[PDB]
Amino acid sequence: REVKLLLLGAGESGKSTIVIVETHFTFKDLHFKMFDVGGQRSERKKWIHCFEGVTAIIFCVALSDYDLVLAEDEEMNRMHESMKLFDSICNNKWFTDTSIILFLNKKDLFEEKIKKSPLTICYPEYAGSNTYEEAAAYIQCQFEDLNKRKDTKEIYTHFTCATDTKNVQFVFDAVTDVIIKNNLKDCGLF
Amino acid sequence: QLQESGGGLEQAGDSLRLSCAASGLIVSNYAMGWFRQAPGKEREFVAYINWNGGVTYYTNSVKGRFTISRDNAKNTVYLQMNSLKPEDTAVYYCARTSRASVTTRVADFGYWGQGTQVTVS
Amino acid sequence: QLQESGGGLVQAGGSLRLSCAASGGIVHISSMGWFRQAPGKQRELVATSPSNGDIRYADSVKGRFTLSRVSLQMNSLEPEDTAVYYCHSFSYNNYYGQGTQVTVSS
Amino acid sequence: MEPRAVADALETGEEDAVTEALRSFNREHSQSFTFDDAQQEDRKRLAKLLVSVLEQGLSPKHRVTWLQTIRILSRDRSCLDSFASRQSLHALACYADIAISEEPIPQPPDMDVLLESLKCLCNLVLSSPTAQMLAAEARLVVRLAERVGLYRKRSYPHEVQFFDLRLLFLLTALRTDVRQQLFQELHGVRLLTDALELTLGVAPKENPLVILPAQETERAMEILKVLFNITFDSVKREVDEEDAALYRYLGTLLRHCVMADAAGDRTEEFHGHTVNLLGNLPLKCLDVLLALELHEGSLEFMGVNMDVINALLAFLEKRLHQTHRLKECVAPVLSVLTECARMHRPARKFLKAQVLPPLRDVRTRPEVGDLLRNKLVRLMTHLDTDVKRVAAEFLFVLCSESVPRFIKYTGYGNAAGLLAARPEGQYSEDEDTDTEEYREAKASINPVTGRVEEKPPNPMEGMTEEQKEHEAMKLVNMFDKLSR
Amino acid sequence: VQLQESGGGLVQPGGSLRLSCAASGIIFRSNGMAWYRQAPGKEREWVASITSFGDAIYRDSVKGRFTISRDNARNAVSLQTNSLKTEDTAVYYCNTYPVNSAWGQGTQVTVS
């Protein structure tokens, strides 16, 4: 009945904002989540480490770094390079039936960085439109179909932004900013 | 489909127990409600019940003499009628509600069945 | 929904005919006109028929650009005004369409 | 008439000819979305002549005709850049008796110019930003507020009232400084609550649900829009005792109308506006919703009334089916429901006993079904950061704010709604819920919950260390700022 | 617009009293009345208020001890003061809660 979690994602997505060992929850269940530091523990016998009985992984990929290119001055973009990790996680036989959790950090930057083209270097083939509600859904559908075993395994896609800035929480104010706009848009033509 | 039982004709002042079981190979885990339909009159609302006996709401006519209960162990819901009056002589139906909220005097939800006739002296 | 027919291949004050077909089904259009878009500026008014008085020409060119039911006859042309032409007329709105271009030289 | 003919008549000046021409033109043409170009140049010159004769004192005869012609002109963008001069705006304001000349009291009730000038003001401010920034400097909000305050001592017609309310709504919605000016300097919330009580007075003391007429519903919706635009700022937590009293008063005024219905089909719009205004009220004021005198035949629960809570829950039910503008529809409902459920044990128990009770379902994913629980847990995986967070907080406060009781349904909802600070909520661990499911709680992997499908690991030790090459694949993304 | 109060004062700690307020010259069905408390100083406290309906709102300091009557169709408003403390001695005014019109005369309340 105890669950294991596996934190993934590059350093720019901010996985530390979500909070190589951490087993002291015990909130009626073990709930053991592991950190991720490459090349630390596995030097003792040259036998590396197992410690894999995980039943749910945690993935954190940012969407603002969509116009970046992790490959230093190369054709391979950054979003494709992040999708490579999803492909590797799905193709591995250690997670053929392990649930996948998707996090998209730093959405507030992407929401206003649509000033550039919607397909500059992420999905150059096609794009639904220039809005958030369509481009984000397209990215979500692509990350969904990137999963091989879409029948048995089902992924969980969740979007995240800043929790609290200097003045006002976003989830308590954006609703007002959209209600005012719709209320004024309903009027006119007198 | 739902089946009703425990009706018929009875003299005024007695007590009668209405039964409603789900024998149409359907589960019963939502809210339930009893409704009446007087001949030549529109279908009215008499009782609303939440599962596990959480909440209950009766119309302003039978607030005192009607009681309703539910036992999910047998997938049955009971409506106890005490001291019958010639005002509530009609066929009585039961239905399940897809809405989680309390809705009143509306037949929005289906799964009626057949209904049992209740008449008073 | 609207379409127009008529070409332009004259370089010295010729006579042309341009027709605009009433392809749409809506009635009570009450007006039909033509335009011209120079390759350096936007569209300009040519002539309209408001069907509620007299026909209105344009102060830009006062030539005998005869217009009737529509059909626009370009007399005393002087094609120093080569451009792309369009038809015009008008749940209430107005429509342009597409049109031909005139190549002028000499 | 023809625009060219009217424009040419505008140069002569015959009193018994140009006015008849304007009247015939207004009688003929009086509908929006006119021609494009055959009216562009000539009617642009006509509007220039009209704004020139308007910058001077126009003829007192047929003032309604002049204002009607200018109103019809103000419906095309080609003339909005011409009519949006400070002089023209001040002229249309003083014609509407809403200018800065506050010395002439509203003694002459000449409405024929008032309603037309208000229509022109609305037309200009709704589609001309320069007109907005001009009216914000001319300060038309003060005289409008004074007029709205003088509604009981002087009975104004429905059209003038509604149009000045619409003008105030447009002005407070588009210009930012007008919001603060009407909030602090004009006591906008008090005046608007007064106007709201004034509108909600058709056959007063209607004990059951009161039906609102068309005009009353329109003006109530407009003043509710104005209140929502004016209130959402600087009302987060800390307020004074008198401000809290006024806010509880407004909350009762809105409670007495949420359960009410309107004529026609504007019931849902009115209820949405009420919920939008509820969202702006301070948290500790929302307790005035659950507090109601338990009448006969009312929804009883925990010895207290629950008619308004059940009403807004059914409103959330009926509103969830608008999937397009879902971010503006159900999010305020969820916010107000959370804030009125966090503070009261009866509301908490009511929501826990009417939203997510049924646990003895056939063991399947909770993110499927027709229940409100299934719809909310489906919405938790939405692409809108404003709606998944509020639904997560709703299901959190419903589970008495307990993470082990939050994983009641899924293990990903916690991943969606964790680390969302702005915590002394009411903690309760008294009732325990066990059915035929919780005896099978040993066979329910927590994020997936109760799927009981088990598969073996497939490397078989032949290539586990070789399957680790995916570690070398993933390690390249760990280091962040510098290689070094 | 004419405001007039009646009844008040002459009581010991633990007594009741009905404070009435007659309002004339204005509409009564659409005006939410309120009661104000003028303490012997330089402050003016707010007692309670009611809407066009019987909906009442009491002050946290007078919760469970005061009640407001409406008496519709009868151009007046009442305010019951029961089980008053030694601090409830002040002058009391009545006025419309949304629109604060001109204050009237008021009645003195003494607890001693």
Numbering used by the authors:
A (entry chain B): 32 to 50, 184 to 354
B (entry chain D): 3 to 123
C (entry chain E): 3 to 71, 78 to 98, 106 to 121
D (entry chain A): 1 to 422, 430 to 491
E (entry chain C): 2 to 113
The authors write:
Ric-8A is a cytosolic guanine nucleotide exchange factor (GEF) that activates heterotrimeric G protein alpha subunits (Gα). As a chaperone required for Gα biogenesis and membrane localization, Ric-8 homologs are essential to life in multicellular eukaryotes. To better understand the structural basis of Ric-8A GEF and chaperone activity, we have determined the structure of the Ric-8A:Gαi1 complex, using both cryo-electron microscopy (cryo-EM) and X-ray crystallography. The variability in the orientation of the helical domain is also suggested by normal-mode analysis of the SAXS data. The coupled interactions between Ric-8A and Gαi1, described above, induce profound conformational changes that dismantle the Gα guanine nucleotide-binding site.
We obtained crystals of Ric-8A:Gα bound to the three Ric-8A-specific Nbs used to generate the cryo-EM structure. Diffraction from these crystals was highly anisotropic, extending to 4.6 Å along a*, and b*, and 3.3 Å along c*, affording measurement of a 90% complete anisotropic dataset. Initial crystallographic phases were determined by molecular replacement and subsequently used to fit the cryo-EM density map. Descriptions of the crystal structure of Ric-8A:Gα refer to chains A and B, the better ordered of the two complexes in the asymmetric unit. The crystal structure of the Ric-8A:Gα complex also reveals continuous electron density for Ric-8A except for the linkage between 422 and 430. In the crystal structure, which lacks Nb9156, the helical domain of Gα and its connections to the GTPase domain, including much of gα1 and all of switch I, are disordered. Otherwise the cryo-EM and X-ray models of Ric-8A:Gα are in good agreement, although certain loop regions in both Gα and Ric-8A show significant divergence. The conformations of Switch II observed in the X-ray and cryo-EM structures differ from each other, and from those adopted in nucleotide-bound Gα28. Phosphorylated rpS435 and rpT440, which are well-ordered and form multiple ion-pair interactions with conserved lysine and arginine side chains in the Ric-8A electropositive groove, help to immobilize the r430–r450 connector and consequently stabilize rαb9 and rRT that interact with gβ4–gβ6. Ric-8 αb9 occupies the site of gα5 in GDP-bound Gα, and consequently gα5 is ejected from the concave surface of the Gα β-sheet.
